[PDB]
Amino acid sequence: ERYENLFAQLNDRREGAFVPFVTLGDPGIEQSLKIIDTLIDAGADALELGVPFSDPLADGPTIQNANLRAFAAGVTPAQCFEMLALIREKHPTIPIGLLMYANLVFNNGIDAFYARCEQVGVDSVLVADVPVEESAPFRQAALRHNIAPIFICPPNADDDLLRQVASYGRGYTYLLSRSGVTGAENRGPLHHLIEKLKEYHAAPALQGFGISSPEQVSAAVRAGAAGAISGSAIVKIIEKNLASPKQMLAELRSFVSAMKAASR
Amino acid sequence: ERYENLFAQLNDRREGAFVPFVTLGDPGIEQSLKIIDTLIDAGADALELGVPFSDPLADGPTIQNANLRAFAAGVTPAQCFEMLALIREKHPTIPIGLLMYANLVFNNGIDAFYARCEQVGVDSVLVADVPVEESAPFRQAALRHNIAPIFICPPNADDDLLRQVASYGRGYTYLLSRSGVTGAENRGPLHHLIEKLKEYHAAPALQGFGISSPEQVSAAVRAGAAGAISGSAIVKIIEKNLASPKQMLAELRSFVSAMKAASR
Amino acid sequence: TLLNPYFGEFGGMYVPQILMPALNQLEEAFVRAQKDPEFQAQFADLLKNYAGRPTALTKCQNITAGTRTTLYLKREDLLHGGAHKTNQVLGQALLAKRMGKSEIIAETGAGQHGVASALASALLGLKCRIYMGAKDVERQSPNVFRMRLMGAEVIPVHSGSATLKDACNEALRDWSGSYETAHYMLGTAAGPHPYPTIVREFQRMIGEETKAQILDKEGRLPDAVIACVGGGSNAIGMFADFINDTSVGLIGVEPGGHGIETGEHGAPLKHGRVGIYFGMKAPMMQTADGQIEESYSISAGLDFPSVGPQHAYLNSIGRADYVSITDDEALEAFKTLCRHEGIIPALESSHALAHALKMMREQPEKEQLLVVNLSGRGDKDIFTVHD
Amino acid sequence: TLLNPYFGEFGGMYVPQILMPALNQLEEAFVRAQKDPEFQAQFADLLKNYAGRPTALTKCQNITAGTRTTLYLKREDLLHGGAHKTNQVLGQALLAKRMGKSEIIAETGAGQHGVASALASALLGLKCRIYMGAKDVERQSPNVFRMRLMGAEVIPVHSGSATLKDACNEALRDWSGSYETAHYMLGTAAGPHPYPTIVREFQRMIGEETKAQILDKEGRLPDAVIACVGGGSNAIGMFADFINDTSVGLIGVEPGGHGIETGEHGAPLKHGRVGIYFGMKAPMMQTADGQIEESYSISAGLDFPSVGPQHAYLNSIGRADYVSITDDEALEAFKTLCRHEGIIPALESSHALAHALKMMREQPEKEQLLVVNLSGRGDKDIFTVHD
Ligand SMILES: O=P(O)(O)/C=C/CCSc1ccccc1O
Ligand SMILES: O=P(O)(O)/C=C/CCSc1ccccc1O
Ligand SMILES: *Cc1c(COP(=O)(O)O)cnc(C)c1O
Ligand SMILES: *Cc1c(COP(=O)(O)O)cnc(C)c1O
Ligand code: NA
Ligand code: NA
Predict the structure, then answer these.
(1) How many Cα atoms sit within 13 Å of A134 on the Cβ side?
(2) Radius of gyration, CA atoms only, chain C
(3) Residues with Cβ < 8 Å from D10, sequence gap 6 or more?
(4) Whether D355 contacts D256, CB under 8 Å
(5) How far away, in angstroms, is D11 Cα from ligand 6 center?
(6) Pick the CATH number of C7-51+85-203 from 1.20.120.1760, 3.40.50.1100, 3.40.1050.10, 2.130.10.10
(7) Do domains D7-51+85-203 and D52-84+204-387 have the same CATH topology?
(8) Mutual orientation of helices B245-261 and B214-223 as an angle, nearest 10°?
(9) Residue A1 is part of which domain span?
């Protein structure tokens, strides 16, 4: 129960969680393992990791290019799970969540995909293109292998949906800041959803989409959410410093330290 | 009565008429006047002359190019009638016939076109695209100005047509050797038509289309026709010798002397 | 002849003597065919099950908004082949067969008549020969290819100006030596009788369908019917059934090119001079000396250098009226129909649309029930309008 | 939902949570529309007076000579726009309007769906946005231009392989942020429910007309109906009304490209693997690791890298059968129809013709009453076949 422990510890500290996102193997396997270690060393509380897919239909330009850069280095799903195993062998307690598209988990059999996550030490799985109406087999498979199934609560959610999300999910509840796709390009009142989710005893909420500045994470915490996820802002620093690996890491450190400090 | 006199004289000599055709102004006005004089000097009995038209739809390749060469030298219809006047001022008795397309005679008024022919000394006019069914105004105009209207008797003529042609025409009757358009390229039994035409007291017949060799003119005479017209074979000698004017005339002489001899 | 070859002072049979029996044969086969219910049923089946008859009559609501004009378009662009030309060729091909002929001769400028003749010959098993000026062949690669794909022989004519005129010459030259086995499938309502009469009659169904159609939907006949005029076939096809309805206006549109005043146009009926050529007495594009001249237009299909004798007649007695439309004016109407109605019109048909658009725009408060004949599809003209 | 989102094991609603209410809204508007005689009368008027409905059913006598097969062709090539796609877009555009929407989003590969969406939006006053992969934009200048002439915004997608797949991605990305004002006009009988059901229903009239038509002319139902399958809309449109007529065979044809054996094809239903993508569970062109792959064919229009869920279902229960046809086989059928019938078929439709031609040629003495759906016009493909 990686997430449960983290949240109890953070509450104990009256702290919010800062969770950065990156695509595995961007710009290369070796630089990626290095990027992730810098992320943790600078203060990340948990990790959201995507495996390269050919058609990421819920992602904006920045993340579309993250996938493109990983494809250019030949990064495959098998290579990803190898990376995942090594990441856990180095860090035993940090919660790890995978951002997945449906075909990559159905391809080889839904059950076997979740068996692999367990084997490697993955904590949760969010499948971007599966709504609750279609979640049964993914939900059942995750629970069977001690993997937490993550559900998305949109800003336009009705009581029936809130009740559903609260009942099925585990680990954390992905609270969408906005309508649309990923992108630090466009910024995204969620007090009512947070309280209703709290009323139905749902898993602690993590706000995602458009979070790119410190003021944004302190606001998420102030509203009642347990933390915030940031992706495009992280990925943009990688893009900016491709020619200088040393400069990339140094810049990644400054950004995540500042973001982590704002959750306090 | 130029044609009438010629035919009486030829019959007196038990001779057939050799009539060559050329396009006025091919390859130039000066060389054309020279070509025509050589034609007469070598033995032509009468003349068939075409004025350059843009769309000669009853003529094959050789004559199509005769028109093209004349257009290249700027030869106009007014220039043609000027040439015609000078040709007559030099030769007082040789019959002269114009090959015309309808628009060139209607353009300026049908009546005025025939008044011009008279003024210049033209003897006959054959309009290639006017059948007997449409000949009334052209017929009436020609007779009014002492110009002989020439009619075409096709190889597929019925008694009604033969009777018509015999009644309306004057000068000579154009007896078509073949179906199709002009061209020495393709050679073309007319005994019945000749006798029927003779029965209806039609004007003496001149065979036209495909005549290019001496044996062909002697055969026309033997059949009962008063003569033969030859165009493409004449025009081809001009085409062949464009770079050598002296050679052109010399070659034109040899050909027409041989052709004239065959009518005897 | 069995029928009158003239429409007032215009028309006739100005061809060499050798072709006169071929014209009398044709005339007689046509008169017989028209009285034969077996021929009629056959022509109707081909039209309906092969060509797509009847065509729709579409109300154009967006384009006329804000004015007192109601505009309908006769959808000849939806006919198999993309143009009205198809109606005609099917009928003429059946006539050739009724006559015992096995070969077809055809002339074409922009390629449309050629494509239509080739498809009809393939369907009815006739050997097709097509004449096209060398300048047009170079300019019309897509259509030349379509023709060949359909099994037709395409022959470039390099004589004269190497355009329509010269292809029209070559066709008759050929026919004068092959009439015994081949039929000449003339492409417009012009040339020697009985062609203007036959083409009209095999194009009559356009106006006949339009009458029943407007009567059903509006319960009234139109105030005017408008059509472009290259050679005259789509226009007379529309006019015919309405000739006796004195209250219905008949309007024909000729190409104005760069402007009548520049001498660069294709409007012989109104700005030419009457002459004799192509077996016909009619207005013509001609020099001062009477040499035949070329027609100019942005649309390649409105380039027949003369006009149908029945139009010259309807004009002289005042039954119909004719006007002209410039290149820019036709481009404008083309652009407007694409944008407001979702229909791409041929540049040819755009001349007619442009005049109806003027009638509206110039007097927006006038109550007017209008019908424009959309003779064809404009996919053809996309690159031209583009450049 | 009000209706079942699955056809056996196939179909579903695999989209991000944010788009689920947009799909429920659509479903409900469709159920209501179908029960509203006012909507039905409006859809029928547009079809009849604007699109050219009903289309002809043509008997092809020359092509089948010497055999015991009787072949008819459903003339969807005569529909406004030159393809069957038009029926669908008119209906979907009326649904968007019924829903209060003013904007349309659309995806396209070869340009056909794009041209159809643009014409329907211009006619019904909707603002149109179209996504096209940059590689396809470069390859399809004529269609891109037609789209822009019709007032639509064309947007090149440079992501991924820059083809259909990637345009399909961009459309949903856009819709997830604009669903409140914009409707996504999906182009085939695939994607998330209710699209496969709605597209079928707005394409039903093809087979419904074919039944009455063959019953009138032959007094019997056909032995089989054949159709090409890119995404599945023209095929299900033909199949639908015949599903309950157990004696009528249903045959779908997928592109075989250079040969199935070379791995260069566009036949996922028969030679792909079931996956989940584009809001659907269905057979798909995919790598071993599950990365989505491109479809290959001589015809650009048969490049949707998957297939409609209803076809995958009809196949599994044995109701319908599916086969494939290679590039050379489609080129051959294309050549043959031009030459013997005077009709230029789209390279897409030529795949269906090619299979009916095989059925004949392989067993010339078998008595067979066949119907092929000629989904479109082939003027489009002249230069391709040429080179
Ligand atoms: O770039 P952001 O900060 O705007 C959002 C990053 C989210 C990463 S996880 C995620 C979650 C749902 C759908 C797509 C995704 O990629
Ligand atoms: O070249 P030919 O010898 O074959 C025929 C020459 C005839 C000249 S007169 C003529 C007569 C009728 C129609 C067209 C003509 O050009
Ligand atoms: C063939 C052609 C014309 C020229 O027409 P006529 O009707 O004979 O004057 C006009 N419009 C279109 C679309 C054409 O294809
Ligand atoms: C658009 C297109 C197709 C692809 O079709 P689906 O019916 O949706 O499978 C097929 N044929 C033509 C002519 C097309 O334009
Ligand atoms: Na004209
Ligand atoms: Na497909």
Answers:
(1) 26
(2) 20
(3) D274, D280, D281, D282, D309, D310, D312, D313
(4) no
(5) 15
(6) 3.40.50.1100
(7) yes
(8) 30
(9) 1-264
Contact present, B76 and B84 (Cβ < 8 Å) = no
Using the atom order of ligand 2, give the atom closest to the CA of residue B235.
Answer: 1
For chain D, give every domain's residue range: 7-51+85-203, 52-84+204-387
Tell how far the Cα of C230 is from the centroid of ligand 3, in angstroms: 6
Q: Is the CB of D234 under 6 A from ligand 4?
A: yes
> CATH code at B20?
3.20.20.70
Cα C201 from Cα C88, distance rounded (Å): 9
Structure tokens, D330 = 């489609």
**Residue ranges in B121-205 assigned as alpha helix (H):** 136-144, 159-168, 191-199
8 A C-beta contact, residue D376 and residue D76: yes
Tell me the C-alpha distance between D26 and D10, whole Å: 20
Q: Which CATH architecture has domain D52-84+204-387?
A: 3-Layer(aba) Sandwich (3.40)
A123 is catalytic: no
The rounded distance, in Å, linking the Cα atoms of C128 and C110 is 18
Flag whether residue B68 sits within 8 Å of chain C, measured between CB atoms: yes
Q: Which two tokens stand for residue D149?
A: 């002439």
Q: Which of A26, A45, A48, A123 is catalytic?
A: A48
Q: Which chains lie within 8 Å of chain A at 3 or more CB pairs, if any?
A: D
Q: Quick one: B31 exposed, middle or buried, by C-beta within 10 A (0-12, 13-18, 19+)?
A: middle
Residues C380, A44: Cα–Cα separation, whole Å: 62
> Which own/partner pairs from C58-64 qualify as long-range (CB within 8 Å, at least 24 positions apart)?
C58/D49, C58/D50, C59/C217, C59/D49, C60/C340, C60/C341, C62/C340, C62/C341, C62/D123, C62/D125, C63/C336, C63/C337, C63/C340, C63/C341, C63/C357, C64/C360
Q: Which of C174, C166, C168 is nearest to C18 (CA)?
A: C174
Alpha-carbon span C298 to C137, nearest angstrom: 17
**Experimental approach:** X-ray
Q: Which residues touch C146 (CB under 8 Å, ≥6 apart)?
A: C111, C115, C118, D344, D379, D382
Please report which helix (H) or strand (E) contains residue C180, including its range: none
Measured distance CA(B109)–CA(B127) in Å, rounded: 15
Alpha carbon distance C103, C124 (integer Å): 11
Give DSSP secondary structure letters for C189-209: S-SSTTHHHHHHHTTTHHHHH
Rg, Å, chain D Cα set: 20
**How far, CA to CA in Å, does D64 sit from each of D71, D219, D336, D337, D377?**
7, 20, 11, 11, 21
Phi and psi torsions of B77, nearest 5° = -65, -35
Tokens of B24: 């006025």
Helix (H) and strand (E) counts in chain D: 15, 14
Listed in sequence order, the residues at least 6 apart from A36 whose beta carbon sits closer than 8 Å to its beta carbon are: A22, A47, A87
Q: Which two tokens stand for residue A193?
A: 């959803």
Within 10 Å of residue B244's Cβ, how many Cβ atoms? 11
**With an 8 Å Cβ cutoff, is D128 touching chain C?**
no
Distance, in Å, from the CA atom of A225 to the CA atom of A207, rounded to the nearest integer, reads 7
C14 bridge partner residues: C279
- The count of structural domains within chain A is 1
Q: Please give the C-alpha separations between residue D26 and each of A77, B214, C171, in angstroms, as whole numbers.
A: 36, 92, 61
**Partners of chain B (3+ Cβ pairs below 8 A):** C
φ, ψ of residue D157 to 5 degrees: the values are -105, 110
